[PDB]
Amino acid sequence: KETAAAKFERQHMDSSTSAASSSNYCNQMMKSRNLTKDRCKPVNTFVHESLADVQAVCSQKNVACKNGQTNCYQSYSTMSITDCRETGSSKYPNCAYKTTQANKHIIVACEGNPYVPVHFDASV
Numbered sequence: 001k002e003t004a005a006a007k008f009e010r011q012h013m014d015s016s017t018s019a020a021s022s023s024n025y026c027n028q029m030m031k032s033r034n035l036t037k038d039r040c041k042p043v044n045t046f047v048h049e050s051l052a053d054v055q056a057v058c059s060q061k062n063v064a065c066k067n068g069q070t071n072c073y074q075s076y077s078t079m080s081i082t083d084c085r086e087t088g089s090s091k092y093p094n095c096a097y098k099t100t101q102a103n104k105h106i107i108v109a110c111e112g113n114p115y116v117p118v119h120f121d122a123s124v
């Protein structure tokens with residue numbers, strides 16, 4: 001089975017580029033990462049940074065997670081993310097997404113050894 005670490009990389013890591021190429025980015029990436037397969041995943045953030053820079057967040061500012069757990073970390077620096085958000089008119093199997101590009105702090109949940117992102121909590 002896929003590790004929580006490996007699932008975080010499939011869902012949230014796009015080291016290819018450094019930002020959204022067009023506004024078809026989400027429609028292609030949500031597809032290529034198997035996020036439109038069972039259902040249309042409604043909201044998903046891709047981080048356009050190196051694995052090393054996103055994993056280092058786990059040594060940065062310790063914060064509460066949305067669920068009340070305290071294994072969350074806020075990045076000290078802003079990071080290049082694409083927010084992917086299903087349109088109101090999107091219907092499975094033809095999933096449609098709005099692509100928003102931004103530079104923001106990420107909050108991730110970390111666990112295991114090595115201590116690495118397992119959950120994308122939010123961008124701030």
Ligand SMILES: [Pt+2]
Nearest residue numbers: 076077078105
């Ligand atoms: Pt800031």
Ligand SMILES: [Pt+2]
Nearest residue numbers: 004109118119
């Ligand atoms: Pt988890």
